[PDB]
Structures are given as C-alpha cells and as structure tokens.
Design a protein around this ligand. Structure first.
Ligand SMILES: [Mg+2]
Ligand SMILES: [Mg+2]
Ligand SMILES: [Mg+2]
Ligand SMILES: [Mg+2]
Ligand SMILES: [Mg+2]
Length: 213
DNA sequence: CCCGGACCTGTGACAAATTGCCCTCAGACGG
DNA sequence: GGCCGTCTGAGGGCAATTTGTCACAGGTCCG
C-alpha cells in the first residue's frame, strides 16, 4: 500500500546527527534516487503535507527550516567524512523545492541492505528512536522477528548522542526507555531488552522483538 | 576496624529545545 | 479579455511537553 524504503546497511550504521524533519525528507531522497544518476531531487509542499498528515503551512515551515539546517552537516562512514549537500537548496516554483545531494553519496545509498515501509516510521517523533528502529530492521527476519546485541559505545558514536548520556542513568532515562516506549506505541513492532554487564559497567543492550501477528 | 576515595545507581531541579496550534496576507489560477 | 474568489503556502508568533544537564542521596569495594 505504501512506499517501501530500502537502504544500504552502511547508511543504517553511519555516524551523523539529523533532526526528525531532516530524516523524514531523507527517506524521500533515497526513494527518488533509487527509482532510476546525478543527485538532484525535488520535494512538493502539498505532497509532504499529505504523507505525514500536516497542514500546508506547517509542512512549509518543516521543509524550509530542515533545509537550511543541513548546511555544514557531515557524514562519516567507518572512516570517511562527506557533506550531505554541495549547493544550497532553492525553490524555482511556489510550493516546490530543488536540492543537490552530494553525488559521491549515491553508492552509499544503493549497495547487505535494510528495508521497511514508510508507514512504519512516520509517526515516530524522536530522531534517535528512528535510528534505533532502523538498526533493528537491519536484522529482521522474513516472518518479522529478530534478536541483536548492540554495543553501548557504538550506539553513542553512531547516533551521535549528546554528552550527558555517557552517564549511564541518564542514558537509561532519556534515551533507552523513551525510544523503546515510542517503538512499542508508534510502530507495529513489539520490543523488549536486557542489559549485558562486565563488572560494574554495562556494555551492551540485547534486543528481542516480534511483529503484531 | 573504619576511614576517605573511586565507582555505581536513581531522582529532583532547572535550562534549552521541539511539538502541534493559531493568525496574516500575498501568489497562482480559472470561471 | 480581465478582475476577483478561492486554494496555497510563506511568514510571524504561542503555550504545553519533551529533551539535555547537573547536584545530591545512597549502595559497593579497595588498600
Ligand atoms: Mg536533534
Ligand atoms: Mg515543525
Ligand atoms: Mg559514621
Ligand atoms: Mg532516605
Ligand atoms: Mg557515601
């Protein structure tokens, strides 16, 4: 029924810092690019509004501010760093935006891959929870279940979590619990976890999950 | 022995950021 | 033909929530 996103695992596991609105736009770019060699994409205000159930006004606000916050953002594949954009965005027509993605990023988008339908993620609010749901999809089985152990330091590096979450009680309270709650409340996935320890330090988080069925 | 100290946990406060809402007014189009 | 009524969207804002930071209470073990 709805668009099927696929992406190279290299993007799922890349290190970057994007907002919710920026990640939403990014899903459409990957969709446009894949359906084809030059990197120029386009976004319609009225289409964006309908996809994510926004008004035209608030859509316009989200696109405009997302777009100017890309400047200077960089992407690291573990390592190699790239800018997302190589030219400012611009609007030829009212309600229409044209963007220039770094053509050297194309092969990192299309490659060992991750896939999900866009309806699975479009109600998630916290961008770190989008990152977690993407990493879990990378390990999902056809039937809809999976289990994976992710290292905490790698979680911090890849999702570029803010500095105070290196204190484990803050990591638990403001990142782990919240994002597990959203996934359980906003996606068709049912997720559980347990902590792996070594001495006094907690080193990994072990995720198990199934599908509504 | 128990100390001060270096670790770990959780919670109460506050500061900074993001959310969906609300209102104005000109652009683009067709009847 | 050309004006105007309507559908858009580009601006300006808001209070209510969520996210990011740090002080302090309270556990263990070390030598
Ligand atoms: Mg952010
Ligand atoms: Mg917004
Ligand atoms: Mg005493
Ligand atoms: Mg007490
Ligand atoms: Mg004490």
């Amino acid at each position: 029924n709805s668009p099927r996103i696929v992406q190279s695992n290299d993007l799922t596991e890349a290190a970057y810092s994007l907002s919710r609105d920026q990640k939403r736009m990014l899903y459409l770019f990957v969709d446009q690019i894949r359906k084809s060699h030059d990197g120029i994409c386009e976004i319609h205000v009225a289409k964006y509004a309908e996809i994510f159930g926004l008004t035209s006004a608030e859509a316009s606000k989200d696109i405009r501010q997302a777009l100017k916050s890309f400047a200077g953002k960089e992407v690291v594949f573990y390592y190699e760093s790239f800018p997302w954009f190589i030219k400012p965005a611009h609007s030829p027509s009212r309600g229409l935006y044209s963007v220039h993605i770094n053509p050297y990023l194309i092969p990192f988008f299309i490659g060992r891959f991750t896939q999900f339908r866009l309806s699975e993620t479009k109600e998630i609010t916290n961008p770190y929870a989008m990152r977690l749901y993407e990493s879990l999809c990378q390990y999902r089985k056809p039937d809809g279940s999976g289990i994976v152990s992710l290292k905490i330091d790698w979680i911090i590096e890849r999702y570029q979590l803010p500095q105070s979450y290196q204190r484990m009680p803050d990591f638990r309270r403001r990142f782990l619990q919240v994002c597990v709650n959203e996934i359980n409340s906003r996606t068709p996935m049912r997720l559980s976890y347990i902590e792996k320890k070594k001495g006094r330090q907690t080193t990994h988080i072990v995720f198990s999950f199934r599908d509504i069925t």
